[PDB]
Design a protein around this ligand. Structure first.
Ligand SMILES: [Mg+2]
Ligand SMILES: [Mg+2]
Ligand SMILES: [Mg+2]
Ligand SMILES: [Mg+2]
Ligand SMILES: [Mg+2]
Ligand SMILES: [Mg+2]
Ligand SMILES: [Mg+2]
Ligand SMILES: [Mg+2]
Ligand SMILES: [Mg+2]
Ligand SMILES: [Mg+2]
Ligand SMILES: [Mg+2]
Ligand SMILES: [Mg+2]
Ligand SMILES: [Mg+2]
Ligand SMILES: [Mg+2]
Ligand SMILES: [Mg+2]
Ligand SMILES: [Mg+2]
Ligand SMILES: [Mg+2]
Ligand SMILES: [Mg+2]
Ligand SMILES: [Mg+2]
Ligand SMILES: [Mg+2]
Ligand SMILES: [Mg+2]
Ligand SMILES: [Mg+2]
Ligand SMILES: [Mg+2]
Ligand SMILES: [Mg+2]
Ligand SMILES: [Mg+2]
Ligand SMILES: [Mg+2]
Ligand SMILES: [Mg+2]
Ligand SMILES: [Mg+2]
Ligand SMILES: [Mg+2]
Ligand SMILES: [Mg+2]
Ligand SMILES: [Mg+2]
Ligand SMILES: [Mg+2]
Ligand SMILES: [Mg+2]
Ligand SMILES: [Mg+2]
Ligand SMILES: [Mg+2]
Ligand SMILES: [Mg+2]
Ligand SMILES: [Mg+2]
Ligand SMILES: [Mg+2]
Ligand SMILES: [Mg+2]
Ligand SMILES: [Mg+2]
Ligand SMILES: [Mg+2]
Ligand SMILES: [Mg+2]
Ligand SMILES: [Mg+2]
Ligand SMILES: [Mg+2]
Ligand SMILES: [Mg+2]
Ligand SMILES: [Mg+2]
Ligand SMILES: [Mg+2]
Ligand SMILES: [Mg+2]
Ligand SMILES: [Mg+2]
Ligand SMILES: [Mg+2]
Ligand SMILES: [Mg+2]
Ligand SMILES: [Mg+2]
Ligand SMILES: [Mg+2]
Ligand SMILES: [Mg+2]
Ligand SMILES: [Mg+2]
Ligand SMILES: [Mg+2]
Ligand SMILES: [Mg+2]
Ligand SMILES: [Mg+2]
Ligand SMILES: [Mg+2]
Ligand SMILES: [Mg+2]
Ligand SMILES: [Mg+2]
Ligand SMILES: [Mg+2]
Ligand SMILES: [Mg+2]
Ligand SMILES: [Mg+2]
Ligand SMILES: [Mg+2]
Ligand SMILES: [Mg+2]
Ligand SMILES: [Mg+2]
Ligand SMILES: [Mg+2]
Ligand SMILES: [Mg+2]
Ligand SMILES: [Mg+2]
Ligand SMILES: [Mg+2]
Ligand SMILES: [Mg+2]
Ligand SMILES: [Mg+2]
Ligand SMILES: [Mg+2]
Ligand SMILES: [Mg+2]
Ligand SMILES: [Mg+2]
Ligand SMILES: [Mg+2]
Ligand SMILES: [Mg+2]
Ligand SMILES: [Mg+2]
Ligand SMILES: [Mg+2]
Ligand SMILES: [Mg+2]
Ligand SMILES: [Mg+2]
Ligand SMILES: [Mg+2]
Ligand SMILES: [Mg+2]
Ligand SMILES: [Mg+2]
Ligand SMILES: [Mg+2]
Ligand SMILES: [Mg+2]
Ligand SMILES: [Mg+2]
Ligand SMILES: [Mg+2]
Ligand SMILES: [Mg+2]
Ligand SMILES: [Mg+2]
Ligand SMILES: [Mg+2]
Ligand SMILES: [Mg+2]
Ligand SMILES: [Mg+2]
Lengths: 72, 94
RNA sequence: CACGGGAAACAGCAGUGAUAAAAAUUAAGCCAUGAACGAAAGUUUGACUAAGUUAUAUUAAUUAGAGUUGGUAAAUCUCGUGCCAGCCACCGCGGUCAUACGAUUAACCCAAAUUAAUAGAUCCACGGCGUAAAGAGUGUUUAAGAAAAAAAAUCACAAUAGAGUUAAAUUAUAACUAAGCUGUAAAAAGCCCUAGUUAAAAUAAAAUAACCCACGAAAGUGACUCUAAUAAUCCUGACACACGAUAGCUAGGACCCAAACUGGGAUUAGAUACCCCACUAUGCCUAGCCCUAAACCCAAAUAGUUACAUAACAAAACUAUUCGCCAGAGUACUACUCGCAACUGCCUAAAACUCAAAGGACUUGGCGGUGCUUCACAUCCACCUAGAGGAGCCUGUUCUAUAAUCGAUAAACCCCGAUAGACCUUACCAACCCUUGCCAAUUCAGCCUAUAUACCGCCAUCUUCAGCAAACCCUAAAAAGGAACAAUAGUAAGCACAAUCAUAGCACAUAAAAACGUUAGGUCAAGGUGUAGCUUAUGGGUUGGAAAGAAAUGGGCUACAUUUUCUACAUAAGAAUAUCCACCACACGAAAGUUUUUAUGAAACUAAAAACCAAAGGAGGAUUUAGCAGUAAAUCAAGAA
C-alpha cells in the first residue's frame, strides 16, 4: 500500500544523508567556492553601472559590502 | 484429432479379395446360392483405389471445415451472431 | 548599421568544389505577356514563354511489383533451427513436435508503386484535488474580485502573557534496624556511601474529576490564585505581514527523574539490536535563533440544499462564489539557480537517462513465531510397554573399485519392481558370428534406444478428508457470492461419505471402500501406444565373464545371560551358573569362519546338518520407531515363487 511509496522516500532520504556525511567537506568547498563567485558577479554587476553611467571611479563612499560571505 | 477406422470398411471386405455369399455379395443371383468366389487382380486394384479415394475425400472434408462469419475483428467475438434464443418451457418461440 | 576595416562577395540563370539522409539543362527564344527606354516603327530582357531532366504528387492507360499473414488487424501448409540463429509499432515469439525465426506452399492487401525511417496535421483539463498526481502548517491584509433577507452570543470554563502559591510522589541528609538490594523468560553484571522505617527543602511533573468536549487562527491548551485578555455590523485573498509541535543551535542559569550517545551484563553464528545496569547531550527556566511533521480529520474558505444520485473502499450526494493546487512512472524531500541570524540546513525545484507501465480499491485462495473457542485418542504434551542408534551377522542403498545393467531414492526410496540373478533369467561387458532376420502377405521385419514434462494402463499421496459437479434461480453487477430453523434466496437428480455387503447368526471391531482434484509424484524395462530416432545395426544369435570392500548408512536377526543356560519333559523335576585358579578351562553368546558330509542341479559359487572354534557384546551418545486389547510383547506352524 501507500507505505510502498514512503519506503522509497525513506530509503532515498537515508541514502542521501549518509552521502552528505561522507561528502561533507567536499560539499563545503564547493559552497564557499560559489559564494566567492556570487560576491564577485555581484561586484561586477555594480562595476558595470559606473562604466555604463560614464563615471570613472566608483562613486564617493562606496565600499560595496560583502553580503554573501557574511558570517558569525 | 481422432480419426476412425470403423469408416469405409464393409463386412467381409478384404485385400485377398474374396466374395463371401452373405457379405460382399447378396446371397442369391438369378441362380440360387452363389459359391465362394475371388475377384480379379484388376477388380481388386479398383476397389482399393476406391477406398484410397474415400480416405482422400474424408481428409479434404476435414480440411474444408474452416469457415466463419466475423463479428467485429477476426478472433474478437464481439458482434458475432449467436443465433436465436432457445424456446422456453411454455412453447414460447422466438 | 557602411564613413572607414577585413577583403575582393552567383542568397540572379545555368553550372562546380567542400559539406549534408537530401543531386534538374554549363539548354532555345523575346513568338505571346510583364518591364525599360523610346515621337514612332522598334530594341533589350537567364523576368517570362516553350522545352529538357526526376516515379515528388494527381490524372490516363500500354505497365507488375512490394509488404504482409500470433494478437490489436485482412490473410498459412510443409520443412529447417532448438532461449541458438533471428524477429516485434505495442503485447510478445524462439528451452525438440514455432501458423511470430529462415525458407518454401496457399492466401491477404496495396499496386507503378510498396515498405522503413524522420517531421508534421491530430492529440490533454470547461476534467479533477478523502484513499489514486493534487487543498499550502496557520491567520490578516494589499492587488483583484463576489454580493436579495438572517447573519454579537457568550464560555459549562483547559486560549494566551505575566506575577504569586503547592497536594501527591521523589531526592539530599540525619536517627534506628537488617544484611543484603536491584534486576529479568531465565540470569549476569551492577550497588552494599545498600535496603525497610521515621523525619524533611529545592528541582521537575501536574492521579481522580474527563463516560466531559470547552478555549485558541493553527501549533496547542485540562494543579491553584489574582492581573491583563480573546481582531473585525463578520464575503474570497498572496511569494506581503505576524505566528508555528518535537528535535536542534547560541549564551547564561537549573538538575528530582527520564534519557539518544557511550561503557559494562546477558542473548546470539554474529547482536554495533530487542532484555539488564549505570551515566551524558537533552528535556526545565531567562534571552536569542531554526521554521520542519503521518504540522492529517490525508476532506480549502463563505453561503446553501437533501433535490438528482450508489465505480470501489472510507466520513452519504451536490450546487453557487472564490483562491490554491494537480498533465505516466521512476530519476527526485535530487542537480543547478534566488533568498534566508541556517554554511552536514530550510525554501524554490529541473533534465539526461531508464521502463510500458507506475498507482488506488476490491475478489477468491493460500499463508500467519496474529486472537479466540473446540478438539488430538497411538497421540502433540503429560503418561504406559517394547524396541532402533552401541556389538556380531543378515540384507538394501550410497560411495570408492570394476571391461561390465536399468528403475525407485523428503514425508510418498532403502528385504523397493524381485512371492527372488550359479548357467538361464539378462536388459550388462568381452570376444566371435548372421543379414527380409518367428509371421499368411507386404522397400518389410526386429529394437529393454530417447521422451513418464506426449500418454493409456496400474498405483502412491493428501485421505477415514468431506466435499466435487452439471441444470437452474437471486444479487441498485456478477472477480465472485448465495446460510441463519420462533429462518433473512436458494432448488437440484449425479459422484463421494454415510447405508448395505465380507470376516458364515447378532452387535462392535477389522477388512474393504474413499470422488474432485493436488504432487508435470511413480513407472516408455508388465504390456500398449503419440513424437522422434537406429536398419551388413541402438537388430538377432553362440561362448565366457560380472555381482570385489576403505568405508558410510537404512531395515532386520541373534545376543549381552538368573523372568537365565542344558537334558528330560509340557507348563511341580535333576544339573549348569564368568570366578576360582592352573581349571585338564568354562557360564551366557558363533547366526561368523575352517573341515567333513548331505539336499538340488549338466555345472556349486547355493541351502541344510554335524565336528571344531569359540570372538565382539556386560543393556547402548544426540536422537528416534511402534502400540489403546485378544492389541503390544513373546512363542510356533503354513503358503506363495
Ligand atoms: Mg531509491
Ligand atoms: Mg554549487
Ligand atoms: Mg485475423
Ligand atoms: Mg550590410
Ligand atoms: Mg569603401
Ligand atoms: Mg554569397
Ligand atoms: Mg545558382
Ligand atoms: Mg549580385
Ligand atoms: Mg557537390
Ligand atoms: Mg529531392
Ligand atoms: Mg537568353
Ligand atoms: Mg516546365
Ligand atoms: Mg504517379
Ligand atoms: Mg516489367
Ligand atoms: Mg547455448
Ligand atoms: Mg519443426
Ligand atoms: Mg506479426
Ligand atoms: Mg516467417
Ligand atoms: Mg507513387
Ligand atoms: Mg478532448
Ligand atoms: Mg470524492
Ligand atoms: Mg495523495
Ligand atoms: Mg509528476
Ligand atoms: Mg488543511
Ligand atoms: Mg496561507
Ligand atoms: Mg511541508
Ligand atoms: Mg476594493
Ligand atoms: Mg450570495
Ligand atoms: Mg515567563
Ligand atoms: Mg512534598
Ligand atoms: Mg522518603
Ligand atoms: Mg529518601
Ligand atoms: Mg520478571
Ligand atoms: Mg553478582
Ligand atoms: Mg482519564
Ligand atoms: Mg479532548
Ligand atoms: Mg473573534
Ligand atoms: Mg479574509
Ligand atoms: Mg518551532
Ligand atoms: Mg528545545
Ligand atoms: Mg543533565
Ligand atoms: Mg540538587
Ligand atoms: Mg538516571
Ligand atoms: Mg554494548
Ligand atoms: Mg540466531
Ligand atoms: Mg523480543
Ligand atoms: Mg544521574
Ligand atoms: Mg517546553
Ligand atoms: Mg497534529
Ligand atoms: Mg491522522
Ligand atoms: Mg497536505
Ligand atoms: Mg483559502
Ligand atoms: Mg474567517
Ligand atoms: Mg440541491
Ligand atoms: Mg462492487
Ligand atoms: Mg514525469
Ligand atoms: Mg525534509
Ligand atoms: Mg534540498
Ligand atoms: Mg524564493
Ligand atoms: Mg507415537
Ligand atoms: Mg497424527
Ligand atoms: Mg539397540
Ligand atoms: Mg546395530
Ligand atoms: Mg543399483
Ligand atoms: Mg563404480
Ligand atoms: Mg535413478
Ligand atoms: Mg525418474
Ligand atoms: Mg517419491
Ligand atoms: Mg520393508
Ligand atoms: Mg548371467
Ligand atoms: Mg540391446
Ligand atoms: Mg532427462
Ligand atoms: Mg508423472
Ligand atoms: Mg499416467
Ligand atoms: Mg456432504
Ligand atoms: Mg455458485
Ligand atoms: Mg451380515
Ligand atoms: Mg462398521
Ligand atoms: Mg484400507
Ligand atoms: Mg463406505
Ligand atoms: Mg517427474
Ligand atoms: Mg520425487
Ligand atoms: Mg515400448
Ligand atoms: Mg510406435
Ligand atoms: Mg548382439
Ligand atoms: Mg550369457
Ligand atoms: Mg553404524
Ligand atoms: Mg529382537
Ligand atoms: Mg529346577
Ligand atoms: Mg555356523
Ligand atoms: Mg567360548
Ligand atoms: Mg568380554
Ligand atoms: Mg523423541
Ligand atoms: Mg511352487
Amino acid at each position: 500500500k501507500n507505505i510502498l511509496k514512503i519506503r522509497r522516500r525513506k530509503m532515498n532520504h537515508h541514502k542521501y544523508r549518509k552521502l552528505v556525511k561522507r561528502t561533507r567537506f567536499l560539499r563545503r568547498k564547493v559552497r564557499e567556492g560559489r559564494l566567492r563567485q556570487k560576491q564577485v558577479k555581484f561586484e561586477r554587476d555594480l562595476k558595470r553601472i559606473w562604466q555604463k553611467a560614464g563615471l570613472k571611479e566608483a562613486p564617493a563612499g562606496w565600499q560595496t559590502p560583502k553580503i554573501y560571505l557574511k558570517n558569525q | 484429432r481422432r480419426k476412425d477406422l470403423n469408416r469405409g470398411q464393409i463386412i467381409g471386405e478384404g485385400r485377398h479379395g474374396f466374395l463371401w455369399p452373405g457379405l460382399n455379395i447378396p446371397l442369391m443371383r438369378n441362380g440360387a446360392v452363389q459359391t465362394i468366389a475371388q475377384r480379379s487382380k484388376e477388380d481388386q486394384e479398383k476397389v482399393e483405389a476406391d477406398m484410397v479415394q474415400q480416405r482422400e475425400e474424408w481428409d479434404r472434408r476435414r480440411k474444408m471445415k474452416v469457415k466463419r462469419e466475423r463479428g467485429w475483428s477476426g478472433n474478437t467475438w464481439g458482434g458475432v451472431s449467436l443465433g436465436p434464443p432457445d424456446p422456453g418451457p411454455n412453447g414460447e418461440t422466438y
